[PDB]
């Protein structure tokens, strides 16, 4: 692999559901890259179907010379209108992927717990989720990191 | 494989739930490694989901010259606040992994039995687990050892 992800620091966590995602990403480039790296933040709106995935942001990083690199990757909150009611409250997943020449080489996944903070709403959740009262808590202590063999050319 | 794990001796076993893990690890290096070896101790807090894993400790060993090596790998107890009530009492697993150049080449797995030693607690287990009264017993007689092919 020409690119190695050293760490992902989860920032502004926990946060209100409507607040942006912020990740500080540190990566090492073993040798100069002529093309760009494409990073994405993907929110899994529903464990039941990939139909509910939302690409929250996508960014091109490059040209990338050899050495250690850092950047803050920000993304707006998911659109609640595309989240099924049954999945809104409870645990879901947020993904950070990076591709080089259309090929995914790394996937970082975090479990995300969306819950009410009010004892009232927690015990008796409304049928129609109240997103303005939901707190997103990314489980930053447990990053799930997957690497994939790709053609670095 | 440039690294071969010869044995893992489980120490301070059984122990109270809050006591640290202690493993004596012996391994052989076939040739000098230019990179570090990364060892981890991972507690599976729940058979139902990887969300409940606790990396208890992580250590960098290196540069590693060719030959025999031994070290004691210690790790603090898992955080009980992150363990689901349904998984606390009964069987779970603990893992020991080692990576080279970020590639996992060995995974050693042990079944762990967490039970009460007190008769009244054993017969009538509380709804909210009493971690201060649980005994952890690692099944040291049955190490499950998985080797993976990596790029050395």
């Amino acid at each position: 692999a020409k690119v190695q992800v050293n760490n992902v620091v989860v920032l502004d966590n926990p946060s209100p559901f409507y607040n942006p995602f912020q990740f500080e990403i540190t990566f090492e480039c073993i040798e100069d890259l002529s093309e760009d790296l494409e990073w994405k933040i993907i929110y899994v709106g529903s464990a039941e179907s990939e139909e509910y995935d939302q690409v929250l942001d996508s960014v091109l990083v490059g040209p990338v010379p050899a050495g250690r690199h850092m950047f803050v990757f920000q993304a707006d909150a998911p659109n609640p209108g595309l989240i099924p009611d049954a999945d809104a409250v409870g645990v879901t997943v947020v993904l950070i992927t990076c591709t080089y020449r259309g090929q995914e080489f790394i996937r970082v996944g975090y479990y995300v717990n969306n819950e009410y903070t009010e004892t009232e709403l927690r015990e008796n959740p409304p049928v129609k989720p109240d997103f303005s009262k939901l707190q997103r808590n990314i489980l930053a202590s447990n990053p799930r990191v997957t690497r994939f063999h790709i053609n670095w050319e | 494989a440039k690294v071969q794990v010869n044995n893992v001796v489980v120490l301070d076993n059984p122990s109270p739930f809050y006591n640290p893990f202690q493993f004596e690890i012996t391994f052989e290096c076939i040739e000098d490694l230019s990179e570090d070896l990364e060892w981890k101790i991972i507690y599976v807090g729940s058979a139902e989901s990887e969300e409940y894993d606790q990396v208890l400790d992580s250590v960098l060993v290196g540069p590693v010259p060719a030959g025999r090596h031994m070290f004691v790998f210690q790790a603090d107890a898992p955080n009980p606040g992150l363990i689901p009530d349904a998984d606390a009492v009964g069987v779970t697993v603990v893992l020991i992994t080692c990576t080279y150049r970020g590639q996992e080449f060995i995974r050693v797995g042990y079944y762990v039995n967490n039970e009460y030693t007190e008769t009244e607690l054993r017969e009538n287990p509380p709804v909210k687990p009493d971690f201060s009264k649980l005994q952890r017993n690692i099944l040291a007689s049955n190490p499950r050892v998985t080797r993976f092919h990596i790029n050395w």
């Binding site: 645990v91 997957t146 994939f148 | 981890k40």
Partner: peptide, 25 residues
Amino acid sequence: STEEKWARLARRIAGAGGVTLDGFG
């Protein structure tokens, strides 16, 4: 089931054809 949900989320985290590890790091 509740377990099926967990397995579905784990599959989304892992994708396919790779090696998933806890941490970087």
